[model samples]
Target: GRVTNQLQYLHKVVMKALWKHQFAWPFRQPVDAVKLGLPDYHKIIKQPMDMGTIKRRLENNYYWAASECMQDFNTMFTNCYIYNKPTDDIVLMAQTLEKIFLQKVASMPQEEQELVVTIP
Candidate 1:
């Protein structure tokens, strides 16, 4: 049994499935577990998913998740205390995350999009 922090990989799989399958309400469907280009979950259901790289990447040198240290960080910038997006927020977390983890892709100079950079 094994686990992965394959959000980028899973995003690709789910995107392809959505594009190819034409789901009527794709967002409501669980991404087909089989499409990650990996072994079936049945083969690894006992394993716990490891998000170490994801956690460390976001934590970075600043340890952004250190709540005590970053108590006022978000409010000074995003005006929020916690880094969460509620349905009412509609803050486009997917795009935010793509920028966070896939910086080279998200920052491709020709993309004509502005990225939000916060200093801690």
Candidate 2:
């Protein structure tokens, strides 16, 4: 709920693009580090997360935080699997993503905060 209309729209657009292109590549691509080629992790692994467990964790980690001089907060859980990138690269990407997430949460307006707090 702590998401502005603009941010929500942006999220929708990103999800739409991923939905459209997630499976556009080859089914069994080879892995190559130098050439930046790697098989799709989700395609090769093919395992869904345990939503029940994840939900519990998210609930436990919910909290408030300031980001970019804005007061916004969230308690949500998301799971994504990266196949091609190295482990270090994956960790860096995750950190970057967390920063982005915090920025968005911090920028949420008061109305958005009210909406978010009402949700479970």
Candidate 3:
């Protein structure tokens, strides 16, 4: 019970941090500037109109968010395990177990699936 509470608390902390920094972009790209209906940057410099640049920017943003979320999860979970008197390696083991379970569920037939999964 104590460990469960610690897990929940740490998860909440990680989620809050993630949400707070979700919009913290590492680079400014022309795609988002146009999508957001912001003013053109012609006065600054003529921007490239290549579709590849836009696609790459989107991919970079996706990868950035995914990596940050995993880092947050690992950091929070590892600390929680340490505070609860468990080996830090348990965090990796738990993640592996979760991944296995996810694969199992993903392979299951739709009619056989009844569990609801949520991520914060």
Candidate 4:
């Protein structure tokens, strides 16, 4: 088998779980600043990463390692919090999703966790 092949497979497993989560909907697609009435969105968040974008990246072989994949995932959350307030319901949703993702990563075996971030 290939080096990252396994990671990609595992990444997809986690990815699907995230996509299925109810809270995933908002973060699933890229933010539409126009509709949301937040024209300053792009200005505040220079790199507006979304879950769908992450999915496309994974499918397109955009991630060289699990860490890079996770980084974008993390970026998604950060973008959410940075733009919205902690008191916002959206932030709560993100927290839920974040916790779920943490548990998934926690469930990963030590070796897999290491592989999750290892460059090699």
TM-score of each model, paired residue for residue: 0.17, 0.29, 0.23, 0.83
Q: Looking at candidate 3, what is the lDDT of residue 30?
A: 26
lDDT of each residue in 1-120, candidate 1, tens digit only: 111223222233422332233222322233344685545443543322212322333334323222322222122223211222455332343334223434433322332222235588
- Comparing candidate 2 with candidate 3, which one achieves the higher lDDT? 3
Model 3 stretches astray by more than 4 angstroms: 1-87, 113-120
Q: Give all candidate RMSDs, comma-separated.
A: 17.8, 11.4, 17.9, 4.8
Best-fitting candidate, measured by TM-score? 4
Q: What digit string (tens of lDDT, one per residue) describes model 4 on residues 1-120?
A: 222643554466678789999889998899999998998999999989988898878777666667677788889999999989879999999999988887776655444322335458
Preferred candidate (lDDT higher): 2 or 4: 4
Give the C-alpha lDDT of model 1.
0.30
In terms of lDDT, the poorest run of 10 residues in model 4 is: 109-118
Note the Cα lDDT for every prediction shown: 0.30, 0.34, 0.35, 0.78
What is the Cα-based lDDT of residue 60 in candidate 1?
46
Lowest-lDDT window of 10 residues in candidate 2? 68-77
User: Model 4 segments beyond 4 Å from truth?
Assistant: 1-6, 109-120
Residue pairs in collision within model 1? none
Identify the runs in model 2 with alpha carbons over 4 angstroms from their true place.
Answer: 1-87, 113-120
- Tens digit of lDDT per residue, candidate 3, span 3-105? 2222332234433333234231211122344665545433433332322332343334332232333443344334334433355554455445335434433
Please list all clashing residue pairs in model 3, or write none if there are none. Answer: none
Cα-based lDDT at residue 62, candidate 2: 31
